[PDB]
Amino acid sequence: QFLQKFCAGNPGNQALLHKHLHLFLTPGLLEAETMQHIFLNNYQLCSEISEPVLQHFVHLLATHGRHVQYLDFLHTVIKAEGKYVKKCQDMIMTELTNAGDDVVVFYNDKASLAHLLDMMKAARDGVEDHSPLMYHISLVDLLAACAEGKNVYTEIKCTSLLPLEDVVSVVTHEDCITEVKMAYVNFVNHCYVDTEVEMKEIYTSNHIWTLFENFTLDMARVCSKREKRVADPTLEKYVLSVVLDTINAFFSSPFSENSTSLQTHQTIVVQLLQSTTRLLECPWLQQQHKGSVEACIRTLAMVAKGRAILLPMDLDAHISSMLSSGASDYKNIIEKLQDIITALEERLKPLVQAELSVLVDVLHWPELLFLEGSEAYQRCESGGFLSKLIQHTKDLMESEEKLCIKVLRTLQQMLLKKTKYGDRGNQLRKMLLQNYLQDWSAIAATQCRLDKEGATKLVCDLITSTKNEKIFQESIGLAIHLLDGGNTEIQKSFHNLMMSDKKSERFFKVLHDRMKRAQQETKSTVEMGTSVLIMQPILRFLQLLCENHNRDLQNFLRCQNNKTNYNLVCETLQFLDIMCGSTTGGLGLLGLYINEDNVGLVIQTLETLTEYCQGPCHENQTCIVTHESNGIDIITALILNDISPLCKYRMDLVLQLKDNASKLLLALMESRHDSENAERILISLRPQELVDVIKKAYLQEEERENSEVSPREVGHNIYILALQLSRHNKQLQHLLKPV
Amino acid sequence: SSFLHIGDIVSLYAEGSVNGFISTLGLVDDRCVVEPAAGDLDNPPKKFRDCLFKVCPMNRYSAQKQYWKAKQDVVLLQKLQHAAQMEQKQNDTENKKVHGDVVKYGSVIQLLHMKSNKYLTVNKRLPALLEKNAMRVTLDATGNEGSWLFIQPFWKLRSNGDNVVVGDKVILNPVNAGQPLHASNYELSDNAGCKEVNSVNCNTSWKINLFMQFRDHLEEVLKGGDVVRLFHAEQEKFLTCDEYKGKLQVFLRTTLRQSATSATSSNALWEVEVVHHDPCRGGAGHWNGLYRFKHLATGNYLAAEENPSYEKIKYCLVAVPHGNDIASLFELDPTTLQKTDSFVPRNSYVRLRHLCTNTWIQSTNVPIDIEEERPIRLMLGTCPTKEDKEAFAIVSVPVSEIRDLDFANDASSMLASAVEKLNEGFISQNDRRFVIQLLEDLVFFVSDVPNNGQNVLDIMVTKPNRERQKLMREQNILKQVFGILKAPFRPLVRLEELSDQKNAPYQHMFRLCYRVLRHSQEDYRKNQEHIAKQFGMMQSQIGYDILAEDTITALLHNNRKLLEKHITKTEVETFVSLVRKNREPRFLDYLSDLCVSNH
Amino acid sequence: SYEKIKYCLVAVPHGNDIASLFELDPTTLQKTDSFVPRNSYVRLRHLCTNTWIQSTNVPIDIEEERPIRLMLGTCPTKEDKEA
Numbered sequence A: 001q002f003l004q005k006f007c008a009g010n011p012g013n014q015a016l017l018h019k020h021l022h023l024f025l026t027p028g029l030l031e032a033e034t035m036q037h038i039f040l041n042n043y044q045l046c047s048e049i050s051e052p053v054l055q056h057f058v059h060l061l062a063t064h065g066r067h068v069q070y071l072d073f074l075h076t077v078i079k080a081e082g083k084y085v086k087k088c089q090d091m092i093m094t095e096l097t098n099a100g101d102d103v104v105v106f107y108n109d110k111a112s113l114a115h116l117l118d119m120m121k122a123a124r125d126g127v128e129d130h131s132p133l134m135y136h137i138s139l140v141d142l143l144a145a146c147a148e149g150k151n152v153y154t155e156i157k158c159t160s161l162l163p164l165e166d167v168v169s170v171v172t173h174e175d176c177i178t179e180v181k182m183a184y185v186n187f188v189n190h191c192y193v194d195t196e197v198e199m200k201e202i203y204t205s206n207h208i209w210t211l212f213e214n215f216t217l218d219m220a221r222v223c224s225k226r227e228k229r230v231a232d233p234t235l236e237k238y239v240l241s242v243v244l245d246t247i248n249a250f251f252s253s254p255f256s257e258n259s260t261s262l263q264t265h266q267t268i269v270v271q272l273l274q275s276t277t278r279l280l281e282c283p284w285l286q287q288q289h290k291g292s293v294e295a296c297i298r299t300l301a302m303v304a305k306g307r308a309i310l311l312p313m314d315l316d317a318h319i320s321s322m323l324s325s326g327a328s329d330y331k332n333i334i335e336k337l338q339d340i341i342t343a344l345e346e347r348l349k350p351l352v353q354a355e356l357s358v359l360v361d362v363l364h365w366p367e368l369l370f371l372e373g374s375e376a377y378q379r380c381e382s383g384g385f386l387s388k389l390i391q392h393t394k395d396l397m398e399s400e401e402k403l404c405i406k407v408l409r410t411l412q413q414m415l416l417k418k419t420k421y422g423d424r425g426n427q428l429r430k431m432l433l434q435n436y437l438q439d440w441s442a443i444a445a446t447q448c449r450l451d452k453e454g455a456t457k458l459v460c461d462l463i464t465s466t467k468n469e470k471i472f473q474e475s476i477g478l479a480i481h482l483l484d485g486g487n488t489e490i491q492k493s494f495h496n497l498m499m500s501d502k503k504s505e506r507f508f509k510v511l512h513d514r515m516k517r518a519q520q521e522t523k524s525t526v527e528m529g530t531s532v533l534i535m536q537p538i539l540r541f542l543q544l545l546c547e548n549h550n551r552d553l554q555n556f557l558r559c560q561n562n563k564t565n566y567n568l569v570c571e572t573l574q575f576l577d578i579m580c581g582s583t584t585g586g587l588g589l590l591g592l593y594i595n596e597d598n599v600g601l602v603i604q605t606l607e608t609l610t611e612y613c614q615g616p617c618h619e620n621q622t623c624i625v626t627h628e629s630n631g632i633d634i635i636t637a638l639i640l641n642d643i644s645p646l647c648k649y650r651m652d653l654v655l656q657l658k659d660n661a662s663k664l665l666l667a668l669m670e671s672r673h674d675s676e677n678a679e680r681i682l683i684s685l686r687p688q689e690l691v692d693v694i695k696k697a698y699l700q701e702e703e704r705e706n707s708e709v710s711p712r713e714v715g716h717n718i719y720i721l722a723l724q725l726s727r728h729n730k731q732l733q734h735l736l737k738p739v
Numbered sequence B: 001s002s003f004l005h006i007g008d009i010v011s012l013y014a015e016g017s018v019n020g021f022i023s024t025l026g027l028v029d030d031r032c033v034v035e036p037a038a039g040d041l042d043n044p045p046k047k048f049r050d051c052l053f054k055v056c057p058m059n060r061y062s063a064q065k066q067y068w069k070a071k072q073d074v075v076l077l078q079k080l081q082h083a084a085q086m087e088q089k090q091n092d093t094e095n096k097k098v099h100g101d102v103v104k105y106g107s108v109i110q111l112l113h114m115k116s117n118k119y120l121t122v123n124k125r126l127p128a129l130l131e132k133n134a135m136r137v138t139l140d141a142t143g144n145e146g147s148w149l150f151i152q153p154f155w156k157l158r159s160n161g162d163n164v165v166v167g168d169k170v171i172l173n174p175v176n177a178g179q180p181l182h183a184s185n186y187e188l189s190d191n192a193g194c195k196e197v198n199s200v201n202c203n204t205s206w207k208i209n210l211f212m213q214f215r216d217h218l219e220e221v222l223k224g225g226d227v228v229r230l231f232h233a234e235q236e237k238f239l240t241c242d243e244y245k246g247k248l249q250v251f252l253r254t255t256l257r258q259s260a261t262s263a264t265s266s267n268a269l270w271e272v273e274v275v276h277h278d279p280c281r282g283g284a285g286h287w288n289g290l291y292r293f294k295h296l297a298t299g300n301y302l303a304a305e306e307n308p309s310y311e312k313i314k315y316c317l318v319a320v321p322h323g324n325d326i327a328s329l330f331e332l333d334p335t336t337l338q339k340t341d342s343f344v345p346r347n348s349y350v351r352l353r354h355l356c357t358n359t360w361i362q363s364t365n366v367p368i369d370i371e372e373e374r375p376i377r378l379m380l381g382t383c384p385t386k387e388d389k390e391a392f393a394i395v396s397v398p399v400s401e402i403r404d405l406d407f408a409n410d411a412s413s414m415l416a417s418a419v420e421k422l423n424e425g426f427i428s429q430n431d432r433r434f435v436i437q438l439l440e441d442l443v444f445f446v447s448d449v450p451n452n453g454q455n456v457l458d459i460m461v462t463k464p465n466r467e468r469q470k471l472m473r474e475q476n477i478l479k480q481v482f483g484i485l486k487a488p489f490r491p492l493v494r495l496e497e498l499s500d501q502k503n504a505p506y507q508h509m510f511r512l513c514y515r516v517l518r519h520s521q522e523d524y525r526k527n528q529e530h531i532a533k534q535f536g537m538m539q540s541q542i543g544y545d546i547l548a549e550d551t552i553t554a555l556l557h558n559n560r561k562l563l564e565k566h567i568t569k570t571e572v573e574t575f576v577s578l579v580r581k582n583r584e585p586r587f588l589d590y591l592s593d594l595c596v597s598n599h
Numbered sequence C: 001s002y003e004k005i006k007y008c009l010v011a012v013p014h015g016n017d018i019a020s021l022f023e024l025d026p027t028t029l030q031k032t033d034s035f036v037p038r039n040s041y042v043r044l045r046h047l048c049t050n051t052w053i054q055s056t057n058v059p060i061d062i063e064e065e066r067p068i069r070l071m072l073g074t075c076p077t078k079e080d081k082e083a
C-alpha cells in the first residue's frame, strides 16, 4: 500500500520503481495491484512496455485463474494520459485470441444466458468487489478498448465474440444491472456504429431499435427518479454518457439516412427526440452534461429536418424554440529560488559549451599531457589513446549504451568545424587549454586519421549489429561527417571493408529492411512517423559514398557479388513514388501529396538518384528508367504539373524540386545513345506539355524576385532535356524549332 | 516429376479436417465450397471442371482501386480511367512476359477459375458468412489486391526459395489478410454436404495436382476438357443425344435449315476427355491416345451396346451413365496423312473407333422414332469394316455458349427439385425464397439486361437473344416453369385466395414465372407455338393479378395463326366478363391490341 | 506387437546380410541418376521388404521420466512429408 501511494500521480516515482520492475514480476494479487499503480497515467511507460510483461500477465490469467487484477492492469496499460496505444491493443487482442477460451469467457448459450440472469438477480443490489460478474464486465470493457483502435481484424473478432442478438437479449431483460448495460452499450458503440467493416449490419437491421426503445425507457425512469428524489448516480452516468454517445453515433452517421424509412422507426425516432426534450427541461443537469444533451438534440433535430419527420405540435414547437435559443514567507523564498536557478542556468549556459569543447581538443592531441620522451608520449603520438577508444567502443556496445552514444557524439564533434562560443566561452576555453595543454584541409586530415584508427570499421560494426536506434543513428551521422566533402580516402576504405568483410550482407539487409519500413509508413500516411526521419540520413550517407563520380561504389549499391543482392537504387525511386502518391499523384493530383514538411526529403531522394546516375554509369540509368514502379511518370509530372498548393505560400521549394527533377532526368540519359531510355521517357512525357512548361518558365520571371533558383535556369535545363530527346522523336524536334 | 509453372491448370486438394477438392457453386454464386463426399484423389469428382485453377503472376491494382473508389471532376475521372486502362495493359503484357516462369516458394501467385474466369480473392474487411471468426473468401472477376497469395511450404523438406514441385503440399497465405485458407467444417444450409472456405489460422494443407501444362495449353490443338461438337460431313448432321421415350438415345438430328452447319444445338455439345494413368491429370490429346466423350447437358458417356435386332448394325451407339467402364473408350483415326502421332489439330476430321469391340462407327438411315410425323432422329451404328467416306469434324464452341449451358443446366436442376417439392405438398419459407431468387435470375438471364436494381417485372428488351431463348426451350426449363404453375393450383395455394397477404409471396413467384414465359418468346415462332400449346391453363387463370393476360396478349400479338386458331368466342366472353367485374381500362386496351395484329 | 509399424528399425551386429541394404530416394527432381549431392534430403527404403521408413511418436522408454527415445518404423506406403 505504501508503494502504491508513493507512485501516485508523479511519473518520476513510477519510473524509479520501474527500474526494479523484475521484483514484482511474480504471481500475486498484491504484486498485480502495484504493477497497475506503477503504469497508471504514464504514456512513456505504457508505450515502452515490452512483450514479457503482457505475455506473463496473459499466462497467469489463463493458468493461475480468473482474476480481475490482470484485466485492471491491462486496461490502464492501453490508455495513458487520454491517448490510446495502438501497439498495446493489437498485442493484447492477439494474446487473448491465441490463449484460448479460458482467458476469454462469454455467456452466449441458452444455459449461459440463464446463468447470467441467475447471477444478475443475485447481485441486483450491487456488484461484489470480487466476483465473475465484474470479471466479465472488465473483459467487455477491455475488448471495447481494443476494438477502439483502427484494426479490421480486431473488430471482426470482437463482433464474433459478442453478436448483436446476444447484446439485445441480455440488455432487454428486466433483471439487468446498469453496470453490464453500460459495458455492453460501450462495446456496441466501439464496435458496431464505429467500424471499418463494410458489413455495417447495425445500420441496416431491426435489432438496434430494441436498444433505442430501451434507452427511451431508461431515460424515462431516470427523470422520474429525479422527480421522486430516488436518483441513482450509476443510472445518471449511464444515460448521460454512453446512451447519448450511442444515439449520436448512429443518427449522425451517413449510413443512417436510409436506416429510418419505415413508420415504426420514424415513431421510435420521435420517441427518442421527445424523451431528450423532457430531459433537458429538468435543471439538475450540469453544464458539462448539458453540452452532450444539446449535441444529441441538435443531431436529432437536423435528422428530423432532413427526413421531414412528423411530430406533435406541442413538442415540435418546443424543440424548435429550444433549437433557436441555442443558436441565438515560504512562497517568497521558493519563488525567489526559482528565479535564481533560472538566472544562474542562463548565465552559465555558454560556459558549458566551452568546457565540453575542451574534451574534443584533448582527444585531438593527448600527447601533450604526457611528458616528452616517455613511452606514453610515443604511444599517443601514433594512435594509442584514440586507437583504444575506437577498439573498445565496439566492446562496450552491449555493456553501456549511453557511453557509446557519448563517444560517438564526441567523435562527430571532432570531425566538425569549430565555432565561436562567445567572449566568456573563449576565455574559459583558452584558460583550460593552457592549464591542460602546454578548414577543409584540416577536416580532411582529421577524417583520414580517424579512418586509420578504425572509425570506418567501428561504424560498420556498429551498424550491422545493433538493437538500439540511437547508436545506429549516431553511427550514420559519424559516417556522414567522415565522408563530408567527398573525401576519396574514406570512400575507398568503405569499399575495401565491404568487399573484405563478410558481414556486408547484414549491412545491406538492415538498410533494405529500414527502407521498406519507410515505404510502408509513407503508404500508411494516407506528424511524420519515426521511419521516414531516419530515412534521410541513410540517403545522405549513400550519396556521400557515391560522391566525386565513384563508379564502383555506385555498382555495389545496385548489386553486389554476395549470395542475395538488395538493389538500394530502386528503393529510393519506389519511396519517391509512394511519397508523391504513385500513379494517382502523377495524374494531376501531385500537389495533394507533397506538403511543406516533406519537400526536403524529396529533394534529398532526387539528389541521391542523380548522384547514382551521374557516373556516367549505364547500369543505374537503365535500372531506374526500366524499373516497374513507373517512377519516371511522377518524376516527369514534377516538371510538368506545378505544385499549386505549395506555390501559394512557398515557391522557392517548388523551383528547387523542379531543378532537382530536371537534373535527375538529364543524368538518366546524359551519356546514352540508345533510344530505349528516350522511348520510355517520351512515353511518360508529352512533347506539347514540355514546350508549354518551357514557355511558362521563360515567362516565369515574375517570381524571380524571391527565388534562390532562377526559373530561367530550370527552364533552360528542361530545354536541353527536350533537345537531347529530339534526336529520337521527330515530333518533338519539329515543335522545338523556333519560327 | 515436374515443376509447377505459371499458366499451368491445377486442382487444389485440401488435406485436414475435410478432405476434398475445392469447387464453386454454379449460377452467379461466388462462394467456394469443399465437398468431401464428391470424391478423392483416386476418384475425382464427376464435374471436375469446377476444381481447375490457373496460376497467374501478380497483377497490381493500385490504379484500378483508385478509379473504383473515386467512382464509388469529369477531367479527373477521365485521367483515372486512362491510368486504369494503362495499368490493365501493363498487367496484361507482364503476364505474357512472365508466362512459363517457374514458381518458387515464398512467391506470390494468383488463382483463376477456368469455368467462371474469376480470381480467388480474400476480403479482410468482410467476415465469412458462416464462420464469423474467419475472413471472407470469394471469387471476383477483376480481382482486388487480395488476389495475391503467398505460396509457402507445408513440409519441412522444402524451404524458401525452392522451386514448387507438382504434388507438393503448400499453404496459400493471402498478402493482405495474413491468414491461410481454411476449409471450414460448417455445412452450408443452401447445399447439403458442401463445406466453406475461409481465411483463418489453421493447419490445412493444399496439394497441387497437375491437370494441364502451360506448353500444352495451345489453342491450336485438341485438349482434354475442350467443348467441341462432332459434325458428320457426309450427312451434314450434328451428333446429339435427347430423351425420346423415357430413355436417353444418341442420334443425328435432321435439320430443315438450308445451312446445316448453322443448326447449332445445346444438346449437341460434347466434351473430350483424355484418359491417362493419373485420373487428375488431363493434358493434350495424341492420335494414338484414348479419348472419352461426355455430354455436357446430361453428363452421360457415349458408348456402344448390343443391337436388339442385330440389320447391318451389330452394335448401336448409346449413352451410359458412368464412364469408368472400358466400353466408353474411343480412338481417333486421322483421315489425312498427319506428321507421326503429334497433337491432334483443332478443327480436323477424325474417325471414331471402339477399343473394346474394335469397330468403326457408321451412320444409318433408319430413324429411331419411326412412329412419329417427320422423324428427325437417325440411329448410329458400328461395323467391323472401315468406311472411308465417313468422318466427324470437330467444330469448336464459343465460351459464351458453354457458360450459358452451365447456367441453364443448373437452373433446370433446381427448378426440377422445386417442382418436386411443390408437388409433394409442403415447401418451407427458405426453399420458396430460393425459388423466387432463381426465377428472377432466370428473368434477367433471358432478358440479358444488366442488373442495376430495376424491378424485374417491369423490364423491356430492345433485342431478344435468340441463343438464350433456344437454350431456354431446349433445356426443358420452360416445362419446369409450366410445372411450377400447375402443381400449386391442383391445395397448397388457391387462386381466389391469392389476394390475401398470407399468399403474397406465392403471387410474386407466379408473376416471375410468367415473365420468363413472356421474355422467353419474342419474335420467335417455335417458342410461341410451344407456349401456346398449353393455352388452356393460361386462359383458366385469367382475371387474377398474375400478369397472365399480358403474356397472352404479347404471345398472340405478333402471330396471326395462333390469334385466329386460339381466340374463339369463349375468350371474348371471358374478357368482356372480366371487364364488367373490374371496370378497369387496362382490359379495354388489351382487347384493342388483340383486335389488330401487326398493324 | 505389429500398431501401424509392421517392421521396426534395429541395429544388427553383422551387415553382410541383405537386411542391411538401403536405397536412397531423392525428394526433388534430380538430373537422371548422377552422383548424390552432399547435404541433400533423401528417403530410406528397405530393399528386402520394399518399405519406407517412417517416424512414430511412441516412446521406447515409456517407463521413465520425460522419455527421449522415439521408435522408428517402416510402412509399405510412402510418406512424402518425411526425409
Ligand SMILES: O=P(O)(O)O[C@@H]1[C@H](O)[C@H](O)[C@@H](OP(=O)(O)O)[C@H](OP(=O)(O)O)[C@H]1O
Pocket: B254, B255, B256, B257, B263, B470, B524, B525, B526
Ligand atoms: O425461321 P423460322 O420460321 O423460325 O424456322 C426455323 C427453321 O426454318 C426450322 O423450322 C427450325 O430448325 P430445325 O427444323 O433444323 O430445328 C428452326 O427452329 P430451331 O431453332 O429449333 O432449329 C426455326 O426457328
